Amino acid sequence: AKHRPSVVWLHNAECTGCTEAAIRTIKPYIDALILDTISLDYQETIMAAAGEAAEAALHQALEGKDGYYLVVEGGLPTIDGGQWGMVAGHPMIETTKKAAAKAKGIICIGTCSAYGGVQKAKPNPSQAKGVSEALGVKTINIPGCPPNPINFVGAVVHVLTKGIPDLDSNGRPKLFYGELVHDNCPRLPHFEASEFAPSFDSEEAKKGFCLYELGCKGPVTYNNCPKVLFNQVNWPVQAGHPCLGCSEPDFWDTMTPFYEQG
Amino acid sequence: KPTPQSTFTGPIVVDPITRIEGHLRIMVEVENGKVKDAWSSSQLFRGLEIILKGRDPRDAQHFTQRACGVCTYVHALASSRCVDDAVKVSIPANARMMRNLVMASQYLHDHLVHFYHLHALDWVDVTAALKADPNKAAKLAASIAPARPGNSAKALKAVQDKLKAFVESGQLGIFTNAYFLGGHKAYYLPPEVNLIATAHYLEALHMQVKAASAMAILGGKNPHTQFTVVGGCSNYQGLTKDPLANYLALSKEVCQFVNECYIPDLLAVAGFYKDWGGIGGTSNYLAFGEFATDDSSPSKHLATSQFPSGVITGRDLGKVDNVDLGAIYEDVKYSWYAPGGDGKHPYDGVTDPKYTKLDDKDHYSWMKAPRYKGKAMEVGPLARTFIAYAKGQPDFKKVVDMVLGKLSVPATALHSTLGRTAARGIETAIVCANMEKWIKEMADSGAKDNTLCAKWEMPEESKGVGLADAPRGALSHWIRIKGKKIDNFQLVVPSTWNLGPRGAQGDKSPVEEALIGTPIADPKRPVEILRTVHAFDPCIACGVH
Ligand code: SF4
Numbered sequence: 118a119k120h121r122p123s124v125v126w127l128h129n130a131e132c133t134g135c136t137e138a139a140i141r142t143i144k145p146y147i148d149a150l151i152l153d154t155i156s157l158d159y160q161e162t163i164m165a166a167a168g169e170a171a172e173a174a175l176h177q178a179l180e181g182k183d184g185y186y187l188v189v190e191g192g193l194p195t196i197d198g199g200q201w202g203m204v205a206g207h208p209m210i211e212t213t214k215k216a217a218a219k220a221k222g223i224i225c226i227g228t229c230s231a232y233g234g235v236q237k238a239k240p241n242p243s244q245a246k247g248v249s250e251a252l253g254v255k256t257i258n259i260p261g262c263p264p265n266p267i268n269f270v271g272a273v274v275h276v277l278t279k280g281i282p283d284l285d286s287n288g289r290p291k292l293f294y295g296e297l298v299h300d301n302c303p304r305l306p307h308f309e310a311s312e313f314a315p316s317f318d319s320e321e322a323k324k325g326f327c328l329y330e331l332g333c334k335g336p337v338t339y340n341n342c343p344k345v346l347f348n349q350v351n352w353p354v355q356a357g358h359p360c361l362g363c364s365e366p367d368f369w370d371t372m373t374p375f376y377e378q379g
Numbered sequence: 380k381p382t383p384q385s386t387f388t389g390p391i392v393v394d395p396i397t398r399i400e401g402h403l404r405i406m407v408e409v410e411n412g413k414v415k416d417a418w419s420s421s422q423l424f425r426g427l428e429i430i431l432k433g434r435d436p437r438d439a440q441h442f443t444q445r446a447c448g449v450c451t452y453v454h455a456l457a458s459s460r461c462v463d464d465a466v467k468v469s470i471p472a473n474a475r476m477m478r479n480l481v482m483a484s485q486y487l488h489d490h491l492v493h494f495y496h497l498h499a500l501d502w503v504d505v506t507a508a509l510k511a512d513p514n515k516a517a518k519l520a521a522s523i524a525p526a527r528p529g530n531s532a533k534a535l536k537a538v539q540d541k542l543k544a545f546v547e548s549g550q551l552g553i554f555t556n557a558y559f560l561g562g563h564k565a566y567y568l569p570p571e572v573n574l575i576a577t578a579h580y581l582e583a584l585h586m587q588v589k590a591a592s593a594m595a596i597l598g599g600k601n602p603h604t605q606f607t608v609v610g611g612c613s614n615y616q617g618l619t620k621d622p623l624a625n626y627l628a629l630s631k632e633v634c635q636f637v638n639e640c641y642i643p644d645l646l647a648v649a650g651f652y653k654d655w656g657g658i659g660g661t662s663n664y665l666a667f668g669e670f671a672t673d674d675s676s677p678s679k680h681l682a683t684s685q686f687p688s689g690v691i692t693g694r695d696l697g698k699v700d701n702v703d704l705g706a707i708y709e710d711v712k713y714s715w716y717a718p719g720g721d722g723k724h725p726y727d728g729v730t731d732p733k734y735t736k737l738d739d740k741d742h743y744s745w746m747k748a749p750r751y752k753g754k755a756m757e758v759g760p761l762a763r764t765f766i767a768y769a770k771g772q773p774d775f776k777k778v779v780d781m782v783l784g785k786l787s788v789p790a791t792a793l794h795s796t797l798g799r800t801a802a803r804g805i806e807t808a809i810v811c812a813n814m815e816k817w818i819k820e821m822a823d824s825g826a827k828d829n830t831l832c833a834k835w836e837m838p839e840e841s842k843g844v845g846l847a848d849a850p851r852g853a854l855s856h857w858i859r860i861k862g863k864k865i866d867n868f869q870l871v872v873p874s875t876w877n878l879g880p881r882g883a884q885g886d887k888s889p890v891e892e893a894l895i896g897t898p899i900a901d902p903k904r905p906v907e908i909l910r911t912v913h914a915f916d917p918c919i920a921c922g923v924h
Pocket residue numbers: 130131132133134135190191226227228229230234235261262263264445448
C-alpha cells in the first residue's frame with residue numbers, strides 16, 4: 118500500500134457547482150482519482166460520515182502525520198464574526214484559516230473561493246471575501262463558474278507530482294488560463310469582419326454570427342473553453358450564447374450588464 | 380428482526396449533514412429511542428435576492444442559476460420563465476421543447492447521483508461488501524436483475540478487489556468514521572447486496588458524466604447551462620440532426636443504467652427496508668407541474684404539465700385541488716430575519732437578514748417558512764407521484780402499481796421515507812420512457828423550422844412569475860420590474876418548502892414533521908435521521924439562496 122497524498126476539501130459560501138464540475142473529470146475519472154491518486158479525506162458532498170463523526174474525520178485529516186493539501190470551494194462570509202456561514206457550529210472563516218495554516222498548498226476551485234464570487238456581488242450583504250483576501254495567503258486559483266474539471270484536476274495532479282504551476286497576476290495557472298477565450302473562438306472571423314448579431318432571434322444569430330454586440334466578454338476573459346469544451350461536447354458560444362466572463366475576478370460587477378458592452 | 384431502536388433519551392445534533400448540498404444542522408429531542416421533536420437549521424446565508432435589486436432583469440437568470448450547482452439549470456429556467464411572463468412574451472414551440480428536454484436530462488443526472496452518491500451510504504454498508512463471495516453475488520444479481528456484464532463474477536471480484544486494497548491501505552478517505560464501520564443494527568442488507576450496490580455506485584460515477592454530456596449538448600455546458608435567453612433559447616445547433624442523434628444515444632445509455640441498475644437496486648433496498656414504509660410520512664403535497672405542452676403562461680404551465688400540478692391535503696388522494704399562486708406566502712418568525720416579515724406573498728417578498736445565535740429556538744434557520752393557506756407543503760418526486768397517481772396519469776399509474784406489486788404493499792405505504800425514496804426512482808423511469816418521444820418531437824419540429832427565440836420589449840413597470848418543478852420540487856421565481864430594472868426578485872425554492880423552519884403559528888415544516896417518530900438504534904451513529912433527511916434530497920443553497 119503506497120501512501121496517497123491527503124486532500125482536505127472545504128465548502129464555504131458556495132453553490133456546489135464546483136464539486137459537481139470536478140466529478141465530470143474523465144482523465145482520469147473521479148473514482149480512479151480518489152482510489153489511486155489522492156486520499157480525499159474530507160468532502161462534505163460525498164463523505165460517509167456526518168456530524169461529529171464528520172468533524173472528527175476533518176480533524177484527523179488536519180493532524181495527519183503526512184500533511185495535507187487544501188482545496189477550498191466557496192467564498193467566506195465575514196459579517197458578524199463570520200456567523201452567517203457555519204459548519205459544526207464554527208464560522209467558516211475560522212475553519213478555513215485553521216486548515217490553511219498547515220496545508221502543503223491551497224487550491225481555490227471556482228471564482229467564489231478565488232475572488233469572492235456571486236455572494237460578494239454588490240451590495241455584498243454577507244461581506245464575503247475570497248480566501249486569499251480573508252486569510253492573507255497566496256492561493257492557486259482555478260476560477261470559472263464553475264471551472265473546467267480539466268483545469269482543476271490538471272492543477273491538482275500537477276501540485277502533487279510537479280510543484281506549483283506558473284501563475285498569472287491573478288493566481289491562475291497559465292497552462293489553462295493563459296489565453297483569452299476570444300482568441301480561440303471559431304466566430305472570431307465574424308468579429309473581424311464586423312459580422313455581429315443584434316438579437317438572438319435574428320438571421321445573423323441563426324447563421325452563427327459573432328455575439329460581441331450581445332455582450333460577449335470573450336475578448337476580456339482568460340479561459341480555455343473553446344479549446345477544451347465542457348462535457349466533451351460543447352461550450353456557451355457554440356450553443357449561441359455570449360461569454361459571461363465567469364473566470365474573471367468580480368465578474369458579477371465588472372461584466373454586467375451581461376447582454377451589453379455598456 | 381423488528382426495527383432496531385435504543386432506549387436513548389436526550390438531544391442529538393447532526394452538524395454537518397453530509398451527502399446533501401449545502402449547510403444543514405438538524406437538532407432532535409429523543410425519548411426512549413424515538414425522535415419526539417425536531418429542528419431543521421440552515422447554516423449559510425448568501426442573499427441572491429438582495430444582490431439582484433436594481434439590476435437588469437435580463438441578468439437575473441445568470442445570478443439565480445448560482446443559487447445551486449447541483450440543481451444547475453433549474454433556476455436559470457425559472458428566472459427565464461419569470462421574466463418571459465413579466466415582459467409578456469410567448470416563447471416558440473422549439474424553445475419550450477428544448478427547455479423541457481434540458482429539464483428531463485437534469486432529472487436523470489440529478490436523481491441518479493442522489494440515489495447512489497448521496498443516499499445509498501445510509502442503506503448500504505460498503506465495508507460489508509468485503510465479506511461477500513463474488514461468485515455468490517453474481518448468481519444473486521443474475522437471478523433478480525437484468526442480465527449484464529457489469530454484474531458477472533469477474534466484474535464483482537474486480538470491484539471487491541479494488542475496495543479491499545483501498546480498505547487495507549488504511550486511508551479510508553470518504554468512508555472515514557462511516558456509521559456502518561464495525562456493523563450497525565440499522566443496516567440490514569446482506570454482504571452480497573452491498574457488493575452489488577457498491578459495484579453500481581462506482582458505475583454510476585462514470586454514468587453521471589454521460590448524463591451530463593447529454594445535457595450539455597443542449598444546455599451548452601454542465602454545470603451551469605448557458606443557452607436560455609428572454610424569449611427562448613440561443614442554441615440553434617441544438618435543433619440539428621447530428622447533435623440530437625448523439626443526445627439520444629447518450630440518453631439511451633443513461634436510461635439503460637436506470638433500468639438495469641438504479642430501479643433494481645432501489646427495489647432490492649426497499650425490499651429489505653420494508654419497515655421504512657411506516658416511518659417519516661407527511662400529509663400535504665404541492666407541485667407546479669413540469670413538461671408542459673403549453674408554456675405560454677404560468678396558467679398554461681399549471682394546466683398542461685405532463686407531470687401534472689396540484690395540491691393534496693391530509694393524504695386525501697380523492698381531492699387534488701388546483702394550485703392558487705395567490706395563496707403562497709412566506710413566514711420568517713422562526714427564521715433569522717428582521718421582525719415584520721411574516722405572511723408575505725412573494726411579489727411583496729422581503730429579505731432582511733437578522734442573526735441571533737446558534738440553536739436559538741426562536742430563530743433557528745436562514746430559510747424562510749413557505750406556507751400554503753397556513754399549511755406546510757411537501758414538494759418533490761413523492762408530491763408529483765401522488766398527484767399524478769391521484770389524477771390517473773397513465774405512466775405513473777402503471778409504474779407505481781408495478782412498484783406496489785413487487786413490494787407487496789398498499790399505496791398508503793408510499794407516505795413515508797421509503798415512499799419518498801421510491802418516488803424518485805419512479806419518475807426517473809418515467810422520464811426515461813419519454814425521452815425518445817420528446818427528442819423526436821423537437822428533431823421533427825426543428826427540421827421544419829428553427830425559430831428559437833421570440834421578439835419582446837422591456838416594460839417600464841410589470842411583474843411576472845416563473846414556475847417549475849425542479850428535481851426537488853415546486854420552484855418559483857417572482858419578479859417586480861420598475862423603471863425597467865429589478866425592483867423585487869424573490870425565489871421560493873423546493874427545499875425552502877421541505878426543509879424550512881416553523882411558520883408563524885409554530886407549525887413544523889415537512890422535514891421536521893417527518894422526523895417525528897424516527898427510531899434511533901444507536902444514538903452515537905444516528906443513520907436513521909440521515910435516511911429521512913436525505914430522502915427529501917435537501918439543497919440548502921437552493922433553500923436559503
Ligand atoms: S464558482 Fe460558481 S459554480 Fe463554483 S461555487 Fe461559486 S457560484 Fe458555484
